[PDB]
Protein backbone atom coordinates (compact mmCIF):
# COMPACT_ATOMS: atom_id res chain seq x y z
CA UNK A 1 0.00 0.00 0.00
CA UNK A 2 1.19 3.50 -0.88
CA UNK A 3 1.30 6.20 1.86
CA UNK A 4 1.03 9.21 -0.45
CA UNK A 5 1.23 9.99 -4.16
CA UNK A 6 0.36 13.57 -5.15
CA UNK A 7 1.98 16.17 -7.40
CA UNK A 8 1.76 19.98 -7.48
CA UNK A 9 2.38 22.22 -10.51
CA UNK A 10 3.92 25.54 -11.51
CA UNK A 11 4.72 28.21 -14.09
CA UNK A 12 2.33 27.04 -16.78
CA UNK A 13 0.65 30.40 -17.51
CA UNK A 14 3.97 32.20 -18.07
CA UNK A 15 4.22 30.67 -21.55
CA UNK A 16 4.65 33.24 -24.35
CA UNK A 17 1.56 31.68 -25.90
CA UNK A 18 -0.68 32.18 -22.85
CA UNK A 19 0.51 35.50 -21.39
CA UNK A 20 2.36 37.01 -24.35
CA UNK A 21 -0.14 35.94 -27.01
CA UNK A 22 -3.22 36.04 -24.79
CA UNK A 23 -5.90 33.80 -26.30
CA UNK A 24 -9.44 34.78 -25.15
CA UNK A 25 -11.78 31.78 -25.13
CA UNK A 26 -15.56 31.65 -24.75
CA UNK A 27 -15.31 28.64 -22.42
CA UNK A 28 -12.86 29.69 -19.72
CA UNK A 29 -9.97 32.14 -19.38
CA UNK A 30 -6.40 30.95 -18.64
CA UNK A 31 -8.12 28.23 -16.60
CA UNK A 32 -9.58 26.54 -19.70
CA UNK A 33 -6.59 27.08 -21.99
CA UNK A 34 -4.18 25.52 -19.50
CA UNK A 35 -6.56 22.86 -18.16
CA UNK A 36 -7.37 21.54 -21.65
CA UNK A 37 -3.88 21.72 -23.18
CA UNK A 38 -2.52 19.92 -20.11
CA UNK A 39 -5.07 17.11 -20.48
CA UNK A 40 -3.50 15.70 -23.65
CA UNK A 41 0.06 16.59 -22.66
CA UNK A 42 -0.57 14.82 -19.36
CA UNK A 43 -2.61 11.92 -20.70
CA UNK A 44 0.26 11.01 -23.02
CA UNK A 45 2.73 10.41 -20.19
CA UNK A 46 0.10 9.72 -17.55
CA UNK A 47 -3.64 10.35 -17.34
CA UNK A 48 -4.76 12.61 -14.49
CA UNK A 49 -7.35 11.50 -11.96
CA UNK A 50 -8.02 15.08 -10.93
CA UNK A 51 -6.48 18.49 -11.38
CA UNK A 52 -7.11 21.13 -8.75
CA UNK A 53 -5.53 24.44 -9.71
CA UNK A 54 -5.23 27.36 -7.32
CA UNK A 55 -3.85 30.60 -8.69
CA UNK A 56 -2.23 33.30 -6.49
CA UNK A 57 -4.19 35.76 -4.38
CA UNK A 58 -7.04 33.26 -4.11
CA UNK A 59 -6.78 29.87 -2.36
CA UNK A 60 -3.36 28.67 -1.19
CA UNK A 61 -3.64 25.42 0.86
CA UNK A 62 -1.03 24.67 3.59
CA UNK A 63 0.58 22.21 1.16
CA UNK A 64 1.35 24.90 -1.44
CA UNK A 65 1.24 28.13 0.58
CA UNK A 66 4.19 26.75 2.55
CA UNK A 67 6.02 24.89 -0.22
CA UNK A 68 4.90 26.93 -3.23
CA UNK A 69 5.90 30.23 -1.63
CA UNK A 70 9.17 28.60 -0.53
CA UNK A 71 10.75 27.77 -3.90
CA UNK A 72 10.21 31.28 -5.30
CA UNK A 73 12.07 31.30 -8.63
CA UNK A 74 9.60 30.70 -11.50
CA UNK A 75 8.98 34.46 -11.64
CA UNK A 76 5.36 33.57 -10.90
CA UNK A 77 3.53 31.64 -8.21
CA UNK A 78 0.91 29.41 -9.82
CA UNK A 79 -0.13 26.20 -8.11
CA UNK A 80 -1.92 23.16 -9.44
CA UNK A 81 -2.75 19.83 -7.82
CA UNK A 82 -2.69 16.70 -9.96
CA UNK A 83 -3.66 13.20 -8.91
CA UNK A 84 -2.44 10.42 -11.21
CA UNK A 85 -2.68 6.64 -10.94
CA UNK A 86 0.82 6.46 -9.45
CA UNK A 87 4.10 8.31 -8.92
CA UNK A 88 5.63 6.07 -11.58
CA UNK A 89 3.66 7.87 -14.21
CA UNK A 90 4.36 11.27 -12.64
CA UNK A 91 8.10 10.66 -12.19
CA UNK A 92 8.26 10.18 -15.96
CA UNK A 93 6.52 13.51 -16.53
CA UNK A 94 8.22 15.29 -13.63
CA UNK A 95 11.61 15.05 -15.31
CA UNK A 96 10.14 15.69 -18.76
CA UNK A 97 8.47 18.75 -17.24
CA UNK A 98 11.41 20.15 -15.28
CA UNK A 99 13.99 19.09 -17.89
CA UNK A 100 12.22 20.88 -20.74
CA UNK A 101 11.25 23.74 -18.43
CA UNK A 102 14.80 23.82 -17.04
CA UNK A 103 16.57 27.16 -16.75
CA UNK A 104 13.45 28.98 -17.94
CA UNK A 105 10.47 29.96 -15.79
CA UNK A 106 7.99 27.57 -17.43
CA UNK A 107 5.75 24.56 -16.69
CA UNK A 108 7.15 22.58 -13.74
CA UNK A 109 6.16 19.81 -11.32
CA UNK A 110 7.21 18.52 -7.90
CA UNK A 111 6.29 15.34 -6.03
CA UNK A 112 4.11 16.26 -3.05
CA UNK A 113 3.22 13.63 -0.46
CA UNK A 114 4.58 13.66 3.08
CA UNK A 115 3.30 12.45 6.45
CA UNK A 116 0.75 14.78 8.15
From Swiss-Prot:
This is La-related protein 6. The RRM domain mediates the association with collagen mRNAs stem-loops. Residues 5-116 form the RRM domain. Interacts (via the HTH domain) with VIM/vimentin. Interacts (via C-terminus) with non-muscle myosin MYH10. Interacts (via C-terminus) with DHX9. A motif (Nuclear export signal) lies at residues 7-14. Regulates the coordinated translation of type I collagen alpha-1 and alpha-2 mRNAs, CO1A1 and CO1A2. Stabilizes mRNAs through high-affinity binding of a stem-loop structure in their 5' UTR. This regulation requires VIM and MYH10 filaments, and the helicase DHX9. It is found in: Cytoplasm; Nucleus. Expressed in numerous tissues. The chain holds residues 180 to 295 of 491 of the full protein.
Amino acid sequence: NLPSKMLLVYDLYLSPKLWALATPQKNGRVQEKVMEHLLKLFGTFGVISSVRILKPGRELPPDIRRISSRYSQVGTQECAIVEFEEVEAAIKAHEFMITESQGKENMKAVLIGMKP
